[PDB]
């Protein structure tokens, strides 16, 4: 025997909510005109954990949205992309949509397709224009 699959789903929905909350507070103390190296790694390792469960249980809406952010933060901490007030505003606008899409799975509903196709472009296009 084993625990019902619902526990793994509700657990990820609750854990993910806590990660988005703690991860969102990192950008608050992290000023856009002076990003600390130690703080950038905290945001990267935070969103990376959400990508694991998002891609295991079949959360394509959250896995894709989280995978793009993992690439931007990776190139920004190792020294491959600049950071300014414009990019910091995108993360805040991104984490907010991730919370809305995450709530859809809580109520057993499909996330808004318009929000997904709109946020993914803002993350992918930034990886090419910032270079």
């Amino acid at each position: 025997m084993s625990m019902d699959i619902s526990d793994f789903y509700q657990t990820f929905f609750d854990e993910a909510d806590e990660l988005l909350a703690d991860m969102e507070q990192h950008l608050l103390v992290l000023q856009p005109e002076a990003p600390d190296a130690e703080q950038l790694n905290a945001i990267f390792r935070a969103a990376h954990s959400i990508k694991g469960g998002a891609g295991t249980f079949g959360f394509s809406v959250l896995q894709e949205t989280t995978h793009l952010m993992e690439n931007l933060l990776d190139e920004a901490r190792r020294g491959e992309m600049q950071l300014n007030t414009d990019i910091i505003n995108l993360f805040l606008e991104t984490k907010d949509i991730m919370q809305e899409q995450l709530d859809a799975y809580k109520q057993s509903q499909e996330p808004d397709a318009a929000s997904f196709d709109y946020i993914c472009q803002a993350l992918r296009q930034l990886a090419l224009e910032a270079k």
Binding site: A21, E24, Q25, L28, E93, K95
Partner: protein, 391 residues
């Protein structure tokens, strides 16, 4: 390193069930506590003593279950920077959000309905309220704004304020829009009172709500959600200064504090929050009034005297104020008196909705039951406030 602890996952449904169990417990002990007081103290000698210790422990466990169900306000304040730091750069402004009292907590069910109301207020401040950096320096005001989202506890309530240092809510613009829809206004209302008139149907900080604000939510819809939760709302703004919007939220809506008044056999109850003072007016403070009525002189001000026996048509009541008792009430800022026969005292009765088997009647808001078994009718203070206006 002070001290650490741990936590375990608990379903919200299980925590909600506790409120139902303790709810009836607090309501059950309240009814039994009243019976022990009316009856003789012989058999209830030690019962009343133990009730005091249980009356306090009953609420301690209740507040404990609620506190465990609440969450820090920082979790709610962590979503405002997303709309402030982002919209400020898009529109071309500089606004710095400040958080005060982050240790405050709030019920989870209340957090799932107060984010959007508050989110709408912040959105209006970053469009109509706060101006551009150039316009602020022209009037001697600092370039960078200063949005403050305060929050703190209040005994059995929670206070949340949204202070702003923007352009401020215009006064002449609210009077012209409120009078058009048919709302009683006047020039005597100060800048703080006119600010409370933006709750008209389909209206908010600006006339263009549906056009500017995307979501169909405004001051009229915000106040609607507050009524469902049992809270209040207050605004203290002024032109050329700032803007502040206070929002209250209760914690327990099952007991109402009010004195039990008697009017010939029949017994009634009056809320305690509305009762100001009480005395026995004599011939040295009673004057007539147009329409066969009277007025009570309280420190020069002649307040209207409303007879409680006329509303309910109670036979054999004390028509004369010198024989009965007159209590000073208040509802909506204005005060008004109320005539009764004899008082009893302060008693915390349990609210009982009458709409479960009939419907609301004019002059009554709720009811309850005394220790013996008779039903006590809770008079509505809002209805009596409108009777004196017609006199």
């Amino acid at each position: 390193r002070s001290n650490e602890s741990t936590s375990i996952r608990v379903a919200v449904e299980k925590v909600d069930q506790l409120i139902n169990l303790v709810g009836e417990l607090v309501i059950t002990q309240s009814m039994l506590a009243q019976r022990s007081s009316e009856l003789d103290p012989v058999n209830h000698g030690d019962l009343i003593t133990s009730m005091g210790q249980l009356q306090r422990n009953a609420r301690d466990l209740q507040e404990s279950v609620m506190s465990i169900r609440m969450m820090p306000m920082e979790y709610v304040f962590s979503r405002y920077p997303r709309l402030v730091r982002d919209l400020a750069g898009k529109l071309g402004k500089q606004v710095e959000l400040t958080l005060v009292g982050s240790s405050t907590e709030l019920d989870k069910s209340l957090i799932e309905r107060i984010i959007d109301p508050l989110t709408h207020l912040v959105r209006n401040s970053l469009d109509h309220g706060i101006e551009l950096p150039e316009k602020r320096l022209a009037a001697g005001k600092n370039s960078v704004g200063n949005l403050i989202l305060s929050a703190e506890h209040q005994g059995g309530n929670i206070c949340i304020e949204v202070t702003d240092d923007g352009a401020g809510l215009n006064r002449e613009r609210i009077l012209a829009k409120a009078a058009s829809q048919g709302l009683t206004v006047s020039e005597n209302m100060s800048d703080d009172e006119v600010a409370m008139l933006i709750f008209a149907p389909g209206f908010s900080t600006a006339e263009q709500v549906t056009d500017v604000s995307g979501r169909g939510v405004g001051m009229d819809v915000v106040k609607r959600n507050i009524q469902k939760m049992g809270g209040h709302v207050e605004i203290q703004s002024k032109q050329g200064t700032g803007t502040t919007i206070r929002i209250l939220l209760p914690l327990t809506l099952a007991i109402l504090d009010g004195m039990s008044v008697r009017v010939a056999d029949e017994v009634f109850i009056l809320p305690l929050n509305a009762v100001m003072e009480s005395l026995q007016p004599r011939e040295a403070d009673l004057h007539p009034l147009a329409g066969g009525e009277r007025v009570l002189e309280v420190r020069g001000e002649y307040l209207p005297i409303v007879e409680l026996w006329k509303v309910f048509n109670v036979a054999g009541a004390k028509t004369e104020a010198t024989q009965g008792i007159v209590v000073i009430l208040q509802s909506g800022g204005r005060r008004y008196a109320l005539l009764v026969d004899q008082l009893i005292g302060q008693h915390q009765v349990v609210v009982k909705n009458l709409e479960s088997n009939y419907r609301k009647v004019p002059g009554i808001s709720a009811a309850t039951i005394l220790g013996d078994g008779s039903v006590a009718l809770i008079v509505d203070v809002s209805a009596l406030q409108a009777i004196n206006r017609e006199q």
